[PDB]
Write a protein that binds this ligand. Structure first.
Ligand SMILES: Cc1cn([C@H]2C[C@H](O)[C@@H](COP(=O)(O)OP(=O)(O)O[C@H]3O[C@H](C)[C@@H](N)[C@H](O)[C@H]3O)O2)c(=O)[nH]c1=O
Ligand SMILES: Cc1cn([C@H]2C[C@H](O)[C@@H](COP(=O)(O)OP(=O)(O)O)O2)c(=O)[nH]c1=O
Lengths: 241, 240
């Protein structure tokens, strides 16, 4: 009777996991989310389908109570000794080791490194340890950050569905990542948000930039005009074929 | 009793002109439209508030019956015999002589020549005769073609309200354009609509181009991608 914890701040992921994991024998599972997340998850917390936790403070208190941990779309990072003492697996919206860090799909639309989904064993470093399973996702011309994120998310759930048995059976793939690849900080993102009106680019590049920064309902890219107006920009694309 | 004819394919222009002209004395006004609004105007047709006409063919059959002609957001050209037969005045959504012909505001957002409304006497050429009155409108950074056009169309009506009494009394300002300006044909406009993915531009330029091509509900600018899907693009801006 494996005992499992799952940390997420995503409703859709929370719902998919429950589905996949609740289907399984010999499994008990507690679900946690973050404190920043008290409202998004107000009906479910109150029903206690999930429970806030400060992983920074108290993550290490789950040592000894669980056999297996999962992080999927989780606002928080797991403490080292938790990760070094319990098997913790991350289900991640990018293709390690490319565009590790913040908003992988945004950076992929711009810099053309592969994007996809990875499930990997957690280590002390971010998006860094043994890969269990991962798959690339196509970026089409007509897609923005939101469409690519949504393909990635679905691939995530399909890949976890494919490997959850092996993991609960504690016999599963572990492959070293092939290079260190690259990381993008939240500051790297923030520096791209302000459009530089004088920057020289092809139309291809302006479009790829505008679509990479388009993800309803967020407001991301902007310019500051003459009169000091702050104007946010988003792009819409439609395939007519 | 001054006999006037008005040609439009726009509902709000139609009821605007009804309101303005309809508050004047000693005028009798007939309204016309293209056969292409037959359906979209059917209810006004049945109430004889307006009546389609095929200008190309039978426009000249208006010769002799009116003292004064107006065109405003019509789909049709007045035939030239009708033009030289009576005073015909165009109420026009551009600032003549800049960006005459197609979608003035779209070219102006890109090429920066002014935009505005112009009320002008019609001659045989397009967007060309003596200017009665016209006024520039501003293009702010956050506006697309829809936004600017709406401002221009509001201005058209304003200007017309200001000069209709003069025109009715047959003594109104007519100045010649300061130059021949420039004209943009359908061929110019269509070419502008296909994006050149390889063209080098500032981001200012990319954004001005795309906002100039944004005009809900239409789909205007597009690129052909590597699989030859035709992809239409539009931009949203939001001053915060
Ligand atoms: C905050 C924010 C998000 N987005 C887009 C791009 C992101 O890839 C996507 C989802 O981000 P999110 O914060 O909605 O939701 P998740 O990916 O659901 O978020 C969680 O998992 C991530 C791995 C963590 N880094 C986040 O802290 C955590 O909240 O939404 C934007 O376009 N603009 C934004 O300001
Ligand atoms: C027909 C069409 C119009 N437009 C925009 C540009 C034109 O300035 C604007 C107005 O033309 P239109 O809506 O044809 O109506 P009316 O003569 O009643 O105004 O719509 C497009 O952007 N694409 C199109 O295909």
């Amino acid at each position: 009777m494996k005992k499992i914890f799952v940390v997420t701040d995503n409703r859709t992921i929370l719902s998919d996991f429950k589905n996949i994991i609740g289907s399984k024998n010999d499994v008990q599972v507690d679900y946690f989310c973050s404190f920043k997340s008290q409202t998004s998850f107000a009906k479910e917390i109150y029903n206690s389908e999930i429970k806030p936790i400060d992983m920074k403070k108290n993550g290490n208190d789950l040592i000894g109570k669980y056999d297996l941990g999962f992080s999927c779309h989780s606002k928080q990072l797991f403490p080292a000794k938790l990760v070094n003492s319990v098997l913790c697996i991350n289900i991640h919206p990018g293709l390690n080791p490319y565009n590790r860090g913040w908003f992988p799909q945004v950076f992929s639309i711009i810099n053309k490194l592969p994007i996809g989904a990875t499930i990997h064993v957690m280590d002390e470093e971010i998006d860094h340890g043994d890969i269990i399973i991962q798959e690339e996702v196509e970026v089409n011309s007509f897609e923005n950050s939101f469409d690519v994120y949504a393909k990635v998310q679905k691939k995530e759930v399909e890949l976890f569905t494919k490997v959850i048995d092996d993991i609960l059976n504690n016999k599963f793939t572990r492959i070293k990542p092939n290079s260190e690849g690259n990381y993008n900080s939240i500051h790297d993102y923030k520096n791209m948000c302000e459009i530089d009106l004088d920057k020289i680019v092809t139309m291809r590049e302006a479009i790829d930039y505008l679509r990479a920064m388009t993800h309803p309902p967020y407001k991301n890219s902007y310019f500051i005009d003459e009169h000091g107006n702050k104007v946010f920009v988003a792009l819409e694309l439609e395939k007519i074929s």
